[PDB]
């Protein structure tokens, strides 16, 4: 499968999540995603085919993971935007107030701005600390997907927020949305990963 940020993948033939970013660990190909998406060794599938398994994850506390893929996968330095793509160029962290977009299998590509950093989410499983908050909308299934600036600086992966009863926060004004992402810098250093760029 071609690995692009934002596309759907399933975990153990049950849950759905979105790919965050193509990465390498030495000769190993992988993608970073949300920790809530799977446990170590869970099986990830793309379009019904097995593409790899969860190599490590932390959740709750943090919300991160990486999936090691088979050598047959094609890593690409891109994030889905509809039928178009955003090229990944690096991981400079943007500041509060910067515009950012996110890509995921449920709401597609949505943009907003970063409103706060170091936010704690009290999920039922336990708190997740240090997340960055944005007001781009998102929905069930977007977890793990890419957060990136239009200039291509990858920011982090979708963790959660204030989903409404229709399964997303797109039906409430940007001012009331809390869409939280795990910063990518700490995941690349924790697991020794290098982002694929173009």
């Amino acid at each position: 499968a071609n690995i692009v940020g934002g596309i759907e993948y399933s975990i153990n033939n049950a849950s759905l999540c979105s790919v965050g970013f193509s990465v390498t660990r030495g000769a190993t190909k992988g993608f970073v995603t949300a920790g809530h998406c799977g446990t170590v060794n869970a099986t990830a599938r793309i379009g019904g085919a097995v593409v790899g398994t969860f190599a490590a994850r932390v959740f709750p506390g943090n919300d991160r993971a990486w999936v090691s893929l088979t050598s047959a996968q094609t890593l690409l330095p891109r994030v889905a935007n509809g039928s178009s793509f955003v090229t990944v160029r690096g991981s400079t962290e943007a500041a509060v107030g910067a515009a950012v977009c996110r890509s995921g299998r449920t709401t597609g590509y949505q943009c907003g701005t970063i409103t706060a950093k170091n936010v704690t989410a009290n999920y039922a499983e336990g708190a997740v600390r240090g997340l960055t908050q944005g007001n781009a909308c998102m929905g069930r299934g977007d977890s793990g997907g890419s957060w990136i600036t239009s200039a291509g600086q990858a920011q982090g992966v979708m963790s959660g927020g204030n989903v409404q009863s229709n399964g997303n926060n797109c039906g409430i004004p940007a001012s009331q949305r809390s869409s939280l992402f795990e910063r990518l810098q700490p995941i690349l250093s924790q697991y020794g990963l290098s982002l694929v760029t173009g």
Binding site: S15, L16, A34, H36, R140, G161, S178
Partner: peptide, 6 residues
């Protein structure tokens, strides 16, 4: 808040 996932 809830994580996400689907």
């Amino acid at each position: 808040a809830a994580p996400x996932x689907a």
